[PDB]
Design a protein around this ligand. Structure first.
Ligand SMILES: Nc1nc2c(ncn2[C@@H]2O[C@H](COP(=O)(O)OP(=O)(O)OP(=O)(O)O)[C@@H](O)[C@H]2O)c(=O)[nH]1
Ligand SMILES: Nc1nc2c(ncn2[C@@H]2O[C@H](COP(=O)(O)OP(=O)(O)OP(=O)(O)O)[C@@H](O)[C@H]2O)c(=O)[nH]1
Ligand SMILES: Nc1nc2c(ncn2[C@@H]2O[C@H](COP(=O)(O)OP(=O)(O)O)[C@@H](O)[C@H]2O)c(=O)[nH]1
Ligand SMILES: [Mg+2]
Ligand SMILES: [Mg+2]
Lengths: 48, 432, 430, 439
């Protein structure tokens, strides 16, 4: 006269906050380009 | 009274058709189940079943089932006709011979039967729209076979193909030059209008304007769908200067050989920072001709233009359009061929584009969609020819095509046709 | 539809299959009794790919176990997830081959293989639309190395159009546990190259190196090696069983990976792999996964990928990730290492995306590559074979069962022709 | 309202009767003591049991069967067994001295003082019956009392009732494996007797069932009980149509009008499927197509006969369970498309199908597993003449030198019987080989 790792370490623990998909797919989190609209005026076509 | 029939085949065809079809139903107010909650423009894309819901005038085909399967299990299950969704058993697997001579002939009969039972209902058939990714086996083979069969079955009816070509350096498969050239040979003498829709250009667009560092296929297909709706709005919405699909083969084709063109859209812009500016007609139409805004990797600065057809939708005014065209003509960086003194066809519709909830785009009064045919398109044909020749020098991958019914020399005449086509572009481009 | 049937022989293939089926059952949420208790609807959508239905609502794998000794299967039946296998499917001999290729391919094989051929025929005709066969075996053992390839030949004679995929554990000269492995390895590869559509080589020394250097746990075991290679097995067909952006089945991979009919030997890899203590420091990003993928030590074979030029390669991504970043990353990888990619076939990398990641993992990558670097395995195997054959050592054992030196001379000539023709393209330029 | 009378004569007859009556008792839910465990009331609008059991009026039921034997061993054993309260005591007719494997003892010396009692009991049983359909008879031929007494009873009922149908589930000897040495003699004699008195005969040799048990149940040490259970299952599957629902109900009358083209040709060999233990059952498909295909394969025949050596004339297939007629006729069409089974030219249509809705019952302590579908097939074939030819060979080779003849002669049997038995067996085989020719 071998911990929990016995070949099962390929996927273990991994709380869900890791599990959500990346940080953005097909959307921009930049404050200068963020898609979300202004709060007060949700819908009125904004051009001229 | 005016109807158009839509064909989708291949992975890319099905994926882009899905995106087009939520956009159309949201535009016309049809719920996903097909019912209408609360005039008759939808006749172009839908047909009333007699009482209640409306059925889209489309057909989906694929040899590999899973995409049609997820469509049939998705939310739009109640919309499409269950036996309008033709599914095979095994995928052609990037092999054009498999999709053209081995398995596709066993499904082409069912597809033509469905075409008959769709066209019999229609009374004022305008034409055919077809979607298929060229760089795929089943898409290429089935598109070739279907266009060939429909040409003899109908004859002079107008057909438009929205082909997605491989990008200059970014591509998915490793043998797609082969089936792409073969499909070019097939559709060159069978299609009236062919639109270039490579992926990398749209990647660049969504990177530059929307600032999307990591887009997926959904955004690409949404822009493609927006282009389709912009093109088609002229038949379903009243406007000052209407244009029909049949008035494309009579405005955009100087010679029967030259019928490949590329698209552009404006404005494709985000939902917070477009919002400081007026989006005036002059600036939107300048963005339209901005070379980096082309949806294909071809430099319009490298060649002359033959013809440009632009459709405006919104509160645009013909005087402003004319003022913009005068500016474009005066600008020196854009030059036209001598034998085309005027080359701008313009249509105006008062129906502004609709916005899909949760999408990238925003909603504005004005939009323009532009279709250009120009001498510079031959660069992509030359690069594909070069890539083909590099692997054809040592007959790589040829044996698997030979073992599926292809004759050895079938690549030769495709090569000769491509050389003749690029020579024809060169001959057209010269000055008198 | 387009499902495939599993058949395994030899103790090595049996041990591989025992873990592979366990991994698949865990992925699809099936308990040892064959009853579905999964959670997601996607878990049951394509269960027909590997499983068959029985009365009462249970599932059974379509796997056939075939061997000459009853001990190995008598052991595997007593293990967990051993009840899934159909008792009829077990076929065994009485004497065994004793690591003799002549025994396993000429004397006992011809007499025994009829029953297993009938069983596989029934299984194949049962399927509505067959896709192909997948087989696991080791070239270092007589019974597997012989009877497996004889069965390959017979199945070729019956289904010329289907695709066959083989997982071969080839013997490496460093960690050698058999003294007569060059003979049966050469005799196997002779028939294997002519018939198999796809063969993929695995090396025990490479597995040991991965387990020690990357995983960094003290006591590697055959169970761990089998689990790793089983994950490699599953990743290949995950895309056939789950939806994805660009679905690509085994035939699509065959089209995009094989330029010439005889060059169908492959080297594989799986990502990511990290130690237990470093699980929370790492960040799951496509750059990290591709850097680990194209790493040399990540490979499943001791052959150095930087010793030659890649003819082509493909990657199967699993998870929800953007396509553009994958494409640009692949382009960057092909650009920064242009010297190690053959130049006359542009854009020699295929990528496919599947939307379902493995059990409990964010994102996974399975890499397959056809490269000239595999020639060293064959070269050193041939050196060992010719050294042992020059003195005719251990030769009467083979010659005493209907075999003669003509077969060995022809096999050596064929194998040398293979390696020469395979390196012929290494220095080829346009 | 509809009833069948059962006769079990000989040791083999009694040992088959035990198993078949156990199976019937379990199937109808009657306890071994004979009392129905209540909970079948509420005006009970169905006499599912009158086919085999008749009420005593309050509680118990009695079978419509009679047991005959000359040795009191098995009869007393049954009288003292677990079913002592079931059978009517004096319908267990027991003899005094065994027939000693001799046809003459049972047909010319000792059978007279027993046949009178047996006929009297059969009359008394039939009087209470109101809608008699026919007789089933179980006997072994290679035994003295079996052959002789069965022949005499067949002759007597043939004149007492006449047109009433009778079916014989006889046990003929196996080709090589057998018990006695004198069985060809009394076998030829008994087939002589039954040819012009039995409407339908069924082949039930032992070695075929042995091999079936070896191949399917994987039991290497079988005994007579397993064979009896298989035969009982066959009988129940055949007769369930009279007492259970079905989409195509088939009476016993649909045998002597559908399976027998000519009056002389009424010998058939049966088959049964599926036959699977409890271990391999849950790992199998057990579909209608598979159970139908397995029924026609030669190795599942109840009798040692190779169907590929002869043609087919008439096949009756009864299904029980959740079977679907669409699947039934699909499987039949597939069989017809399959080549290795060829029918006679003058019989273009040759299948009679019946459907029954009660799935087979399972006996505790048994070998078979519980299944939701099963099929029983009865086939008329011209290859059956092989067993008669081989029996004739075994007869005349040892008859050439007159062995064992004195044992029959001194008991009162005329020597001339063997000659005429040879004659009509030759005539029968001539008829069989004549029918097989093409038209
Ligand atoms: N723009 C765009 N291109 C796509 C899409 N899907 C596939 N493609 C292109 O199609 C090429 C490969 O062909 P696929 O469409 O994936 O498959 P296919 O056309 O059905 O042909 P098979 O591979 O035989 O099934 C890829 O290189 C992509 O560039 C899509 O949704 N949008
Ligand atoms: N399959 C099967 N055959 C049996 C069984 N019991 C007896 N036999 C057959 O009966 C034949 C011999 O006749 P027995 O039944 O023993 O005796 P018997 O028919 O009463 O005639 P006697 O001997 O004169 O009393 C044997 O060859 C067996 O084939 C049985 O339980 N199962
Ligand atoms: N990965 C793995 N390889 C094994 C295992 N058992 C045996 N092997 C391999 O099998 C080879 C010997 O082959 P052998 O057992 O003689 O094959 P057989 O004759 O068909 O039984 C060795 O080189 C081992 O590497 C196992 O459990 N896992
Ligand atoms: Mg596809
Ligand atoms: Mg007796």
């Amino acid at each position: 006269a071998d911990e929990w790792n016995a070949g099962k370490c390929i996927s273990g623990e991994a709380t869900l906050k890791e599990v959500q998909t990346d940080k953005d797919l097909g959307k921009t989190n930049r404050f200068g380009f963020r898609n979300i609209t202004k709060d007060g005026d949700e819908n009125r076509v904004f051009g001229v | 009274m005016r109807e158009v029939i839509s064909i989708h085949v291949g992975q890319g065809g099905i994926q882009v058709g899905n995106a087009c079809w939520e956009l159309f139903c949201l535009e016309h107010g049809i719920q996903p189940d097909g019912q209408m909650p609360s005039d008759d423009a939808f006749n172009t894309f839908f047909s009333e079943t007699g009482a209640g819901k409306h059925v889209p005038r489309a057909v989906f085909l694929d040899l590999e089932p899973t995409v049609i399967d997820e469509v049939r299990t998705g939310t739009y299950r109640q919309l499409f006709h269950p036996e309008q969704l033709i599914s095979g058993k095994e995928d052609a697997a990037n092999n054009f011979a498999r999709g053209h001579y081995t398995i596709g002939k066993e499904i082409v009969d069912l597809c033509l039967d469905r075409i008959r039972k769709l066209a019999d209902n229609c009374t004022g058939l305008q034409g055919f729209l077809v979607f298929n990714s060229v760089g795929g086996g089943t898409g290429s083979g089935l598109g070739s076979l279907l266009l060939e069969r429909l040409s003899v079955d109908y004859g002079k009816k107008s057909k438009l193909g929205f082909t997605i070509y491989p990008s200059p350096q970014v591509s998915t498969a490793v043998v797609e030059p082969y089936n792409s050239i073969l499909s070019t040979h097939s559709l060159l003498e069978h299609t009236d209008v062919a639109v270039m829709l490579d992926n990398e250009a749209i990647y660049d667009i969504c990177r530059r304007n929307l600032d999307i560092e990591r887009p997926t296929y959904t955004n690409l297909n949404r822009l493609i769908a927006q282009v389709i709706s912009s093109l088609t709005a002229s038949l379903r919405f009243d406007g000052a200067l209407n244009v029909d699909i049949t008035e494309f083969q009579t405005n955009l084709v100087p010679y029967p050989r030259i019928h490949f063109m590329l698209s552009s859209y404006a404005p494709i812009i985000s939902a917070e920072k477009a919002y400081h500016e007026q989006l005036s007609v002059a600036e939107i139409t300048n963005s339209a001709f901005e070379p980096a805004n082309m949806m294909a990797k071809c430099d319009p600065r490298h060649g002359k233009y033959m013809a440009c057809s632009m459709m405006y939708r919104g509160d645009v005014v013909p005087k402003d359009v004319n003022a913009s065209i005068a500016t474009i003509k005066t600008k020196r960086t854009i030059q036209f061929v001598d034998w085309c003194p005027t080359g701008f066809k313009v249509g105006i519709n008062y129906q502004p584009p609709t916005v899909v909830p949760g999408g990238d785009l925003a909603k504005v009064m004005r939009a323009v969609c532009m279709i250009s045919n120009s001498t510079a398109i031959a660069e992509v044909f030359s690069r594909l020819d070069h890539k083909f020749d590099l692997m054809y020098a040592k007959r790589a991958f040829v044996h698997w095509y030979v073992g599926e019914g292809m004759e050895e020399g079938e690549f030769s005449e495709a090569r000769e046709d491509l050389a003749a086509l690029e020579k024809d572009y060169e001959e057209v481009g010269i000055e008198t | 539809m387009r499902e495939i049937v599993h058949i395994q022989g030899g103790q090595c293939g049996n041990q591989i299959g025992a873990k592979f089926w366990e991994v698949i059952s865990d992925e699809h949420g099936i308990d040892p009794t064959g009853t579905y208790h999964g959670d997601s609807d996607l878990q049951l959508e394509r269960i027909n790919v590997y499983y068959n239905e029985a009365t009462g609502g249970r599932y059974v794998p379509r796997a056939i176990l075939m061997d000459l000794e009853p001990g190995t299967m008598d052991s595997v039946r007593a293990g967990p997830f051993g009840q899934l296998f159909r008792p009829d499917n077990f076929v065994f001999g009485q004497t065994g081959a004793g690591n003799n290729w002549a025994k396993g391919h000429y004397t006992e094989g011809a007499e025994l293989i009829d029953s297993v051929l009938d069983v596989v025929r029934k299984e194949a005709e049962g399927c509505d639309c067959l896709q192909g066969f997948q087989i696991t075996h080791s070239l270092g053992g007589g019974t597997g190395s012989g009877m497996g390839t004889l069965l390959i030949s017979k199945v070729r004679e019956e289904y010329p159009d289907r695709i066959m995929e083989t997982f071969s554990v080839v013997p490496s000269p460093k960690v050698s546990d058999t003294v007569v492995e060059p003979y049966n390895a050469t005799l196997s590869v002779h028939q294997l190259v002519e018939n198999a559509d796809e063969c993929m080589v695995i090396d025990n020394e490479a597995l040991y190196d991965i387990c020690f250097r990357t995983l960094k746990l003290t006591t590697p075991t055959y169970g761990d090696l089998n689990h790793l290679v089983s994950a490699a097995m599953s990743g290949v067909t995950c895309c056939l069983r789950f939806p994805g952006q660009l679905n690509s089945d085994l035939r699509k991979l065959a089209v995009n990976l094989i330029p010439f009919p005889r060059l169908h030997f492959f080297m594989i890899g799986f990502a990511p792999l990290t130690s237990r203590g470093s699980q929370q420091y790492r960040a799951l990003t496509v750059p990290e996964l591709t850097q680990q993928m194209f790493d040399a030590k990540n490979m499943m074979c001791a052959a150095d990928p930087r010793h030659g030029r890649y003819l082509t390669a493909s990657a199967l991504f699993r998870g929800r990730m953007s396509t553009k970043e994958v494409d640009e990353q692949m382009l960057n990888v092909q650009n920064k290492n242009s010297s190690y990619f053959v130049e006359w076939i542009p854009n020699n990398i295929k990528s496919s995306i599947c939307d379902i990641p493995p059990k409990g993992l964010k994102m996974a990558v399975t890499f397959v590559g056809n490269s000239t670097a595999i020639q060293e395995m064959f070269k050193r195997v041939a050196e060992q074979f010719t050294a042992m054959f020059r003195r005719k050592a251990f030769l009467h054992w083979y010659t005493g069962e209907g075999m003669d030196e003509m077969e060995f001379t022809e096999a050596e000539s064929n194998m040398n022709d293979l390696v020469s023709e395979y390196q012929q393209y290494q220095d080829a330029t346009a």
